[PDB]
């Protein structure tokens, strides 16, 4: 089925699922990555950069798991986003050193949450072509 | 009946009710929880974090009670939110060390108030599944 | 008649009226009260808090009186808001140490003003039930 | 005729008129007056306060006169706003120590300008009733 | 023909034209002029003030010329805006010591640019009446 | 075909293409260039200035390549934007010392990304006329 799916396992919680077997349906995503134009003398690109990905999802059985990880600073052991479109896989993201840094959960005004994850290493792969990019990986 | 309900008791005021017996009908909620990506050396997660929950409700007989607690820094002894949806219980939140930190009460432009509560320990439980998360609890 | 009414007397000006006899019809109100989560060591709640109430009203014969009080830092000797709804009294607010801190008066774009009052002590009373709250009073 | 009119004379320019004889038709006004809740020890109310009135008007023959006064810091010798409504005079404002502090002139997106005036002394008078207020006057 | 026209010559580039012969059709303008209420002791009005005029225009053959002047800090030798309305000349602006300080060029979302010019001396003249104002001129 | 096209090669990645042969179709662009009015004593125009161009595009096979370059601070060896309109070439931009400084990639709320590039030298050329501008080039 078409759309955005997350495959995630916490370092202490283990596999986090919703109700693409084992994957959580994501309603929307925004990957935001910032690099200053001027690199501080002697500073690594990675330390200068800020990568965050915000996932919007229906509140579900994973919602307690994410909420706990946030407060306990639990790292995600596995974090992979796969995007399907008309049928076929389009994009695969993978992220390393993933920490949850913000959650908002809210009612209608169904129940929705926005979860923001900060990461270090990343990978994006265009499936049809096989072109991939990665930085700060392993 | 479907929707968001609060069960609350003040440490000095005692049980706070409106007109789900003993529970206050809440129109909307937003649970906002922030964790810095970089943890200050020697700082607890809890001290780095900020958890707030904002409740929107019709002004009612509890409105004076909340307004007083706010000005007197009265802690909530009990603070539990239960969310029902089509029929059935979906989610239970519990919060510890609950202090009211902001209120806005206002006319049409019926009478509505937004109440913001800061907390320390929290719990969220997905009812159907029993999956729960908690941090900084007791 | 239904709506929001103010009963106000200045310490030097005396009773301030418009054209609920002696009360000023208010179009809208917003009571905003802020309490920091962390209380500075040795600081009173009252000094940490900020209470303001903003009243929206048609410009009228009281408009010069409020405008003068603002510039002269005249305290309100009496300041009571009463809210009526369908018929019956709903809520009574009373405020102490009331100073006007901001006015905006403006044309259509009838003549309207927004008046912001800062206070110390406050009271809110739910009429039907008699439940009341107050802080920093007398 | 109904609406907002300005009567103004510059200290060096003399009488400033448009095409209520001698008065400039104003499209809109906003009188904004701010008083800090806490008065700095030994500070006059007037020095703590900020009064500004913003007038919106069609660009006209007075537009060069206001634009020049702004750049030359020319004080207004006379500055009176009169407001007429259905027929009859409603309100009279008078301002002292009037300096122009901001102009924006702009095309359709007819030709319009917003002019912001800072003042010290002020007066507002409700015509029908004769109730007046003033502060920091002469 | 009605509207806003610019006559401009760069100090090094010479005359800058588009496709009112020799004048560039401007879609919109905003002249923004700021004067602080308090003049720093010993500071000229001109140094305290900030005058900027923002011109919105279709991208055209002048677009490279303005873009270059911006990066090279080239002063405009001539800068005159004339505004025609129903037929007849309404207003003439002239500006001295004109430097381009910001450009945004952008696609539909035809090709449009917003160009912001900072100036020192200025003049505005109401044509029908001949009333003029100027400050900081020559 | 009409619209905005990018021709780009990374210094390490080589040619970056999508699915105007070899050019990437761009949905929208915004070239933003800022020059302070006051040039710091002894500072070059280039160091005072900030030039950025933001490109909006469908996520595609180039998306991994741009995302990697961003994190690795890879400079673009070639960066040329060409704009076609009704049929014919309108504008050519060229940029030097191009670094990617920000990306946002996001879902519908197809898959879209906004990519912000900072540059030093630039050129813009109006094709029909041949008028060109450039600063800080080679």
Author numbering:
A (entry chain A), B (entry chain A), C (entry chain A), D (entry chain A), E (entry chain A), F (entry chain A): 2 to 20, 26 to 92, 103 to 125, 140 to 168
Could you pull the original sentences from the published paper?
Hemolysin co-regulated protein 1 (Hcp1) is a component of the cluster 1 Type VI secretion system (T6SS1) that plays a key role during the intracellular lifecycle of Burkholderia pseudomallei. Hemolysin co-regulated protein 1 (Hcp1), encoded by bpss1498 (BPS_RS26895), is a component of T6SS1 and forms the secretion tube of this system that is necessary for the transport of effectors from the bacterial cytoplasm into host cells. One critical virulence factor expressed by B. pseudomallei is the cluster 1 Type VI secretion system (T6SS1) that has been shown to influence the intracellular behavior of this pathogen and be required for multinucleated giant cell (MNGC) formation. Hcp1 is recognized as a promising target antigen for developing melioidosis diagnostics and vaccines.
While the gene encoding Hcp1 is retained across B. pseudomallei strains, variants of hcp1 have recently been identified. The prevalence of hcp1 variants was assessed in 1,283 primary clinical B. pseudomallei isolates from 9 hospitals in Northeast Thailand, and in addition to wild-type Hcp1 (Hcp1wt), two variants designated variant A (Hcp1variant A) and variant B (Hcp1variant B) were identified. Sequence analysis of 1,283 primary clinical isolates of B. pseudomallei demonstrated the presence of 8 hcp1 alleles encoding three types of Hcp1 proteins, including Hcp1wt (98.05%), Hcp1variant A (1.87%) and Hcp1variant B (0.08%). Since Hcp1 is known to play a role in cell-to-cell spread in cell culture, the efficiency of multinucleated giant cell (MNGC) formation was determined using B. pseudomallei strains expressing the three different Hcp1 types. For control purposes, B. pseudomallei K96243 containing hcp1wt, hcp1variant A or hcp1variant B were constructed for use in these assays. Interestingly, when Hcp1variant A was expressed in B. pseudomallei K96243, this strain retained the ability to stimulate MNGC formation in A549 cells. In contrast, however, similar experiments with the Hcp1variant B demonstrated a decreased ability of B. pseudomallei to stimulate MNGC formation. Collectively, these results show that B. pseudomallei strains expressing variants of Hcp1 elicit variable antibody responses in melioidosis patients and differ in their ability to promote MNGC formation in cell culture.
